[PDB]
Amino acid sequence: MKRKGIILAGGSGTRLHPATLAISKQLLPVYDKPMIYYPLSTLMLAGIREILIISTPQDTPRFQQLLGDGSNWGLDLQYAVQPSPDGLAQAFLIGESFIGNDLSALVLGDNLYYGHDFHELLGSASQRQTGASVFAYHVLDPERYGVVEFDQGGKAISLEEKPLEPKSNYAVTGLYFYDQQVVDIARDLKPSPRGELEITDVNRAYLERGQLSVEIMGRGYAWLDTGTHDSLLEAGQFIATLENRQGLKVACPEEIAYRQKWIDAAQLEKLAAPLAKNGYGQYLKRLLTETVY
Amino acid sequence: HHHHHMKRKGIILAGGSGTRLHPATLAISKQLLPVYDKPMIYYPLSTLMLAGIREILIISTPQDTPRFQQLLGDGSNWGLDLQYAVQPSPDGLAQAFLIGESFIGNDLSALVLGDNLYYGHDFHELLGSASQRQTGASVFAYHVLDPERYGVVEFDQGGKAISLEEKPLEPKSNYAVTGLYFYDQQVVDIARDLKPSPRGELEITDVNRAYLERGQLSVEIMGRGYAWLDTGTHDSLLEAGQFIATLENRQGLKVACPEEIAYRQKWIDAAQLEKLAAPLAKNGYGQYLKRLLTETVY
Amino acid sequence: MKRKGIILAGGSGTRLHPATLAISKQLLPVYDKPMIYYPLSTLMLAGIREILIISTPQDTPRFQQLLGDGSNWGLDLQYAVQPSPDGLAQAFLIGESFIGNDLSALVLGDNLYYGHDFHELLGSASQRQTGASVFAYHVLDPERYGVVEFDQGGKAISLEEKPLEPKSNYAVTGLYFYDQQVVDIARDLKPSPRGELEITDVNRAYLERGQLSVEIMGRGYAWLDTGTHDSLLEAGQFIATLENRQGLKVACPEEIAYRQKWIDAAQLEKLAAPLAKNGYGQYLKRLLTETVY
Amino acid sequence: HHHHHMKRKGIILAGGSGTRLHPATLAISKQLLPVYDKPMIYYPLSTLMLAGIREILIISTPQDTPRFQQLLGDGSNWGLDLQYAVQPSPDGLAQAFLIGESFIGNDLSALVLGDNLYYGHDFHELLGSASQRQTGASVFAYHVLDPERYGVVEFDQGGKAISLEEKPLEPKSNYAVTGLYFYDQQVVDIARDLKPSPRGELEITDVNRAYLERGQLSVEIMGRGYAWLDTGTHDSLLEAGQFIATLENRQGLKVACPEEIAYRQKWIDAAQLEKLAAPLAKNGYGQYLKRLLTETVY
Ligand SMILES: CN(c1c(N)n(Cc2cccc(Br)c2)c(=O)[nH]c1=O)S(=O)(=O)c1ccccc1
Ligand SMILES: CN(c1c(N)n(Cc2cccc(Br)c2)c(=O)[nH]c1=O)S(=O)(=O)c1ccccc1
Ligand SMILES: CN(c1c(N)n(Cc2cccc(Br)c2)c(=O)[nH]c1=O)S(=O)(=O)c1ccccc1
Ligand SMILES: CN(c1c(N)n(Cc2cccc(Br)c2)c(=O)[nH]c1=O)S(=O)(=O)c1ccccc1
Ligand SMILES: [Cl-]
Numbered sequence A, C: 001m002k003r004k005g006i007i008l009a010g011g012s013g014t015r016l017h018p019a020t021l022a023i024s025k026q027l028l029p030v031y032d033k034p035m036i037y038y039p040l041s042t043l044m045l046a047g048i049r050e051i052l053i054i055s056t057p058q059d060t061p062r063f064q065q066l067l068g069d070g071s072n073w074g075l076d077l078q079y080a081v082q083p084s085p086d087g088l089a090q091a092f093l094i095g096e097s098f099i100g101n102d103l104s105a106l107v108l109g110d111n112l113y114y115g116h117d118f119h120e121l122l123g124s125a126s127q128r129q130t131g132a133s134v135f136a137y138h139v140l141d142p143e144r145y146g147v148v149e150f151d152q153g154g155k156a157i158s159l160e161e162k163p164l165e166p167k168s169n170y171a172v173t174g175l176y177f178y179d180q181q182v183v184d185i186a187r188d189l190k191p192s193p194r195g196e197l198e199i200t201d202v203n204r205a206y207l208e209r210g211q212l213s214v215e216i217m218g219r220g221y222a223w224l225d226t227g228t229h230d231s232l233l234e235a236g237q238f239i240a241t242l243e244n245r246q247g248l249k250v251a252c253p254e255e256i257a258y259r260q261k262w263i264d265a266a267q268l269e270k271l272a273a274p275l276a277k278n279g280y281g282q283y284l285k286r287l288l289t290e291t292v293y
Numbered sequence B, D: 001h002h003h004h005h006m007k008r009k010g011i012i013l014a015g016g017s018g019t020r021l022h023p024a025t026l027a028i029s030k031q032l033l034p035v036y037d038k039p040m041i042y043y044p045l046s047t048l049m050l051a052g053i054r055e056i057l058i059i060s061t062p063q064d065t066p067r068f069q070q071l072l073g074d075g076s077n078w079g080l081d082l083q084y085a086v087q088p089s090p091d092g093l094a095q096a097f098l099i100g101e102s103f104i105g106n107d108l109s110a111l112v113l114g115d116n117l118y119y120g121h122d123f124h125e126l127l128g129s130a131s132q133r134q135t136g137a138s139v140f141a142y143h144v145l146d147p148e149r150y151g152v153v154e155f156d157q158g159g160k161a162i163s164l165e166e167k168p169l170e171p172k173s174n175y176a177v178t179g180l181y182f183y184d185q186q187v188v189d190i191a192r193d194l195k196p197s198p199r200g201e202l203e204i205t206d207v208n209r210a211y212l213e214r215g216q217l218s219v220e221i222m223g224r225g226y227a228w229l230d231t232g233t234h235d236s237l238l239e240a241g242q243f244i245a246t247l248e249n250r251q252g253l254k255v256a257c258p259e260e261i262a263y264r265q266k267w268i269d270a271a272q273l274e275k276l277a278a279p280l281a282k283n284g285y286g287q288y289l290k291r292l293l294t295e296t297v298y
């Protein structure tokens, strides 16, 4: 079966104002590229080419202007709007017609991942034709997230959204893989006490039926925090340190399309031309003649 | 016949950065990118406010003017009056005086680059000296590692500025001209007579050289105890953010908070500052504005 | 066969003076722990418990004072001196009696690694009873390192030390696994034109006999640069960002010993006592009651 | 009978940090850790040199005194005279005056913490005012986020300092006393009469309060345009390193280069500075010392 992707790049309220007064958090850069390149690249690494970008009404033209229809990168991009930030599970209602009868994956527009064999980690989750897959990651501050509790055998037995007394330090990350049941589960959700349609309620519905795979994303992966001005700075410095050490980019969509064979050398060469005078286009030109393992 | 019985107006040039920082700047102008906790343009705006300037023209691209207007409005909230103009093509810094000719009128002026960040002690007093000069031009020179990127000032043995060179391959000194410029009423006429350089730009260094040739350029040293932060590259932008974060988290005080500067200048009163804090009350920025109302800061 | 480890933590000349005037680079911290904890942890992750620490004559008492005989961490540590910085291959002459008839691994005392399944990456190299194994890593500045050239099939065909015209961007990292032949190869080395016994000559001797395994260390791993004041800062910020995000430490030797079962819960509890009032001892105490996957 | 016909001596307290930063500090004292490109102790040493102080006592643990001596020697290379003393047990900051009693003799003094870093414009002049006071004590107050970690100064409505509290749970202000202290000849006698606090330390705040009670404490504000960098935690040490790196790489000038300060004070001449550059000539620090010989820096 085909798997379609959704990037939810909705409003971060007023929490980062005045920095985000003028423009959505996900159109701002982490080091050298727009924040949205990172979760987009995550979906591309999972082999997903048909992708819905959900943003605020005000910033959808900007996401559209930035990414186009995706055909330059061998993708098929569509756009939709989330009028009010009334919960992550709204993605599946907004995206119901887009998803149709296919499998799906949701990624949050402000989620950054780095590490070895992430392609294989996503490949495994994407291969499951039934059930849902999520990733749990050990964090200092689990109370900010959906929290997973495990029994002594290591089986996931409960999920709580932003608990006052977290049962573990394992947070659910902002990457979710779903089968054909998710739209119908989302359509039956009721708003929580904080007035949102909760993705954790979606995940708990799968858990109750024994159909939730909780994979550990180990400590050798970085799931970088973009929630505060402080953590934003850290993410930028993290990406800068890797890129300047390696001479290789993290989450370059043009590169990922080229390595997936979704575009050819001639198309990559055309994409390198507009930015030929700066580091990004120079990088793209170098991809045409260097073997990188 | 004219009658006498002067005001200084400000201009912020915030016209993006072409393709130099793409793809980071594909969706939005460089000068709306945050430096740590606030939009880049807050920093040079705060610099003009610290110079006592209340009437300011923001020059930006046609595409992003509405975003600057959304952010800053007409300035009345901060005791300012802000006007807006567009720069359809990036034809050089000195074009600010042609675009802003009607805005300037017969007044003195100051131009600041929308990506210039300054920090340090007695900066208010450093600006005061330049602002109080009613004739000629005033610029600031700062020692940098890479003067070849800038307008460079050469000094004689007595410390007098004797030449200015734009991006010399072999700089005569390490003293770069910073992106803050004070001018008298001669500047619009000087700017009108400029020809484009080989790189296709109306050059601010040519304006400054015109004042130098008339013996009316003051070059003040901005000493090494001030920070003039680099926003030219993705690397330097990260450094700028880290620098501001380090200071603010150490001190519990903000750098370039326009609400604060307006309040300290008595351009807005306590009642007004309280109203500005209300929308941001659930975040650290609003809580800071609230703390300002009761705390004495020296 | 048993595999023994060597950490070469010798002099970095005058290149980082005056910062390193008073004390060796490898006794200074990267964020929250002495630099030497990082390569030590790397050897421990490879399952190596018997380890020789080689330092300058002046700083050996300090390494000795810091780490002891290793019995507190379930290790067997020994110490030796490198009087002059006359090449990395001197490790095998200095360490000849220590190595005896066993397999060996050498790590540089200023080499920091991070990433997922690094234990498995080292396990594979450590399992080889014959030949040598090294890791190649794509870098911006290969001219600083031993550089590997590959043919079109991806086979390593040459190695050059600090070439003026590097044949690729793949640098050999500072972790080397050797069979029982390395001492004898090292004993036959002649000094290079720069007056050093070159580890690259050791590696080329294995390459010539078709006995060098060059594994790619992929871009999902971080091999952090400690060669300059600038890169030192970056390494610290990199480790800080991971540790403060996760609430888990990178290269905590006490933790690695505890997870290898080289020390028990009662021994870890004793190790947590001296530093109980600071973050490091608090971390160690938390390890006794938390399951980390 | 004594005869009259004053000199100020300096003390740097560099006695480690107990176990607080272990295991990072197991092998070496905190004050020998680099901040970016130079040992931590260069920063407060440079601060005393900027105050015009040439005769300085370094107090350290018995274990690390040889390392400080290896680094700094007798000071003659930099136009200083350095002496050394040991602090066998960490019994409080004010113990510096008992350990250093013979060193101080009948002179004025200044005490700086070996982990205190300062940066900013006219810092030389800020120190000058304090140094020139021949009687009483002078300290500096700085606005911080976390005054509960420090000696805290309370001010009346006229801006006069009226109380000092060590680590108050409910601070009266956000003004912390920095780790730089200027004293007259009364300090050794004040220090001799101190009793240990509940935490088992001879407290500098008690010394300062004694001067306050005699009406002889000057509290000068170190304004928000100066950086007083935090070295208390692993996090803050990284921030300090990043802050210095950002300034030095922007300016092509160093912060707290003792060779430079000695040269600018005319305590060493060009010939001597050339000799100091020779050992470090293949690295950036030696190349910097060389550049100093030909370049005019304002
Ligand atoms: C660093 N990573 C990475 C690669 N590894 N590869 C190589 C690569 C490997 C496998 C398949 C493809 Br297509 C491409 C790449 O071309 N671009 C990459 O950015 S990643 O898998 O950790 C990742 C990327 C984006 C967002 C989150 C994680
Ligand atoms: C840190 N500085 C500063 C202050 N010093 N004051 C206090 C202050 C002092 C004097 C006059 C006024 Br109004 C307000 C303040 O309210 N806000 C400030 O940000 S500054 O002079 O380095 C500066 C600010 C913006 C851009 C460039 C430099
Ligand atoms: C982050 N890493 C790591 C772990 N992964 N584990 C868990 C762990 C996994 C497998 C075996 C053991 Br023992 C312990 C751990 O206990 N401590 C660790 O630091 S690492 O493998 O990338 C690494 C450590 C030191 C130096 C270089 C790399
Ligand atoms: C950056 N500063 C500085 C200088 N300003 N000068 C120039 C200079 C100016 C005035 C007198 C002398 Br001597 C030397 C210098 O040669 N070295 C300097 O580091 S400082 O005043 O913020 C300072 C230094 C060390 C520790 C704390 C603060
Ligand atoms: Cl892992």
Ligand SMILES: [Cl-]
Binding pocket: B222, B223, B224, B225, B226, D120, D121, D122
């Ligand atoms: Cl200065």
Ligand SMILES: [Cl-]
Binding pocket: A115, A116, A117, C217, C218, C219, C220, C221
């Ligand atoms: Cl990889």
Ligand SMILES: [Cl-]
Binding pocket: B120, B121, B122, D222, D223, D224, D225, D226
């Ligand atoms: Cl100030």
